[PDB]
Design a protein around this ligand. Structure first.
Ligand code: PTY
Ligand code: PTY
Ligand code: FE
Ligand code: FE
Lengths: 319, 319
């Protein structure tokens, strides 16, 4: 049995739509119809999409089998998605779309910190961590210290900003990739102080794979691409009056830096960690075993919300 | 909990991939990587796809919310697909892609019969119907007679071709849209005779809606488009040595002819049914109530398989 469908009530259009006598007329008629779309933003998106879609098909002479393979692929991508897995985001990520959209929507005007992709490992349950405390238990990897200031593009400190941070442990796992999730690990939620300063202890993150077991994984193998991300520390900074910044810093030295499978890496976000070999200083910062630590010293420069919106709308006129 | 992912074993590429310092470099790097795709057809498809995708994003300055809406839409489309519902095909259909691909892959060489979309109502269980017999029980709608000849493009009759035909009843339902499907209705499987001739009784099909209750239905309403198909009779003709023809004929007089929601209609496939007001002839053809019938007289011209393939690859030279 199959459902009886129901007419949606839209009338036959009063437009000149000649019966297609060649493949081009399909496109022409569809584009004519698209002009009936009443929201002009929707109309623009629809028109531009259709043109690209039809041009793609014409340029490639897509075959029946290739079209059907595409259909089945897109279907399987949707069907593997769950509240804990977003294969369509992963497809957007690996095809560079996520990163391109992210850039366009968060233009780094006036020397702002650049954004980078969020990925799937953010949790809204990270513990509160005071400045100087650790997001990582002892034994989760090599010591790293992170510090800087949250500032406006004009240089003014931003107090009370919320800084969410998360990363892998030394094995390349986020805390929710373990069976025993008794307590959060390698993540924290901080607040910039009254001078906009923040500091915390952490571990040196490591490279890791994105999901290669579903359709996106199959695609990467046909493209002879890897499914790896280089090491990074995630940060998300929010503060009323500013454009929320979702970003990451990528330590130098990782062989995947130039070929991030999701195009998170940006030049300004690759950081050279400083080796601090000063046992006294290490212990004073609260590293329990002292010795030495890698230092990641970086400010987080936020764009006032009105400036971000203005930049985006002004740049969208060019394009 | 989330799965540990696994590296796919592809190495970091030895390519010059500068860390993006502007959004354009995302695209440049992705296109460079794409050259590692080993199958040159895949490489071509991937490259063309990526360029269109990235151009679409740049031209529109797609917003974060629009991107996320798209993601969620595509997800829902996949998730509603089942063995009995293909919402991705419906999306391809309503955006004209299915019809465009179908045309390109079944070029009407030497004025052969043009193809048209299959839709979802084909069944491989249709009963055998002898020439002159009916695919429709009495009381399923207005009488129609269908006849013609199956031929090669050189004019040679094609004997023993298998002709699958199906259609709605006068209420606009296919047989599998009813609770009681004890037996097939308004469908049949014929064989062309030794002179390539076929003939059968049927009913005049009627306009009907495609599924409007899923994501594609929501999209059509935002585009101020209807979800209707004009009246049509489906045919699928197969014969060893020839390109299988999936087509449909669309009776004149239907207000949706110019605006088929899935772009099945083609100029050559619109047919003017002849009103035969001849009680005697109606009875002689086996119409039980006599009176009158509409006549659909159309030949089915098949392309020899080698010719179809040649035409397609020659046309792909242009593009
Ligand atoms: C907007 C204008 C531009 C759009 C125009 C076209 C969109 C629809 C048509 C898709 C065309 C398909 C051809 C692309 C091929 C690329 C990869 C080729 C290699 C390959 O074999 O990949 C298989 C299928 O991948 C695939 O099927 C990849 C499909 C990619 C889908 C298109 C983009 C998805 C959306 C991205 C994010 C959405 C954000 C919203 C803006 C993987 O399968 P396999 O190798 O295991 O087996 C089948 C192999 N013979
Ligand atoms: C070869 C295989 C082929 C497979 C088929 C091709 C696949 C191509 C991709 C199709 C994506 C279309 C998704 C649009 C969903 C819109 C409908 C959602 C439901 C709903 O009621 O949403 C409304 C949106 O309608 C609207 O937005 C109506 C306007 C429709 C515009 C369509 C273009 C939008 C951007 C899509 C980019 C995808 C990249 C290419 C793969 C309100 O929500 P809203 O108003 O906020 O929605 C704006 C963001 N779209
Ligand atoms: Fe990550
Ligand atoms: Fe139909």
């Amino acid at each position: 049995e199959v459902d009886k469908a129901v007419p949606n009530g839209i009338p036959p259009p009063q437009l000149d739509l000649p019966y297609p006598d060649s493949p081009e007329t399909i496109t022409d008629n569809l584009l004519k119809l698209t002009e009936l779309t009443p929201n002009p933003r929707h109309r623009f998106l629809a028109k531009t999409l259709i043109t690209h879609l039809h041009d793609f098909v014409k340029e490639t002479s897509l075959t029946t089998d290739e079209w059907m393979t595409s259909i089945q692929f897109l279907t399987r991508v949707g069907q593997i998605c769950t509240p804990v897995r977003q294969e369509f985001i992963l497809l957007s990520d690996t095809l560079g779309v996520s990163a391109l959209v992210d850039a366009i929507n968060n233009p780094p005007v006036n020397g702002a910190t650049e954004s980078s992709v969020l990925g799937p490992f953010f949790t809204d349950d990270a513990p509160d961590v005071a400045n100087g405390e650790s997001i990582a238990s002892e034994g989760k990897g090599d010591y790293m210290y992170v510090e800087g200031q949250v500032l406006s593009t004009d240089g003014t400190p931003v107090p009370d900003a919320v800084i969410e941070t998360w990363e892998t442990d030394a094995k390349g796992f986020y805390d929710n990739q373990y069976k025993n999730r008794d307590h959060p690990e390698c993540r924290g939620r901080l607040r910039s102080d009254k001078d906009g300063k923040f500091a915390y202890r952490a571990v040196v993150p490591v490279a890791y794979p994105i999901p290669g077991d579903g359709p996106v994984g199959e695609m990467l193998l046909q493209l002879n691409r890897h499914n790896m991300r280089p090491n990074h520390l995630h940060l998300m900074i929010s503060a009323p009056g500013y454009n929320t910044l979702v970003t990451a810093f990528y330590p130098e030295g990782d062989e995947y830096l130039s070929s991030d499978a999701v195009f998170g890496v940006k030049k300004s976000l690759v950081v050279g960690l400083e080796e601090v070999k000063d046992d006294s200083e290490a212990r004073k910062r609260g590293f329990a075993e002292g010795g030495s630590f890698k230092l990641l010293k970086r400010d987080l420069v936020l764009v006032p919300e009105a400036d971000s919106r203005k930049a985006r709308e002004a740049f969208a006129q060019e394009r």
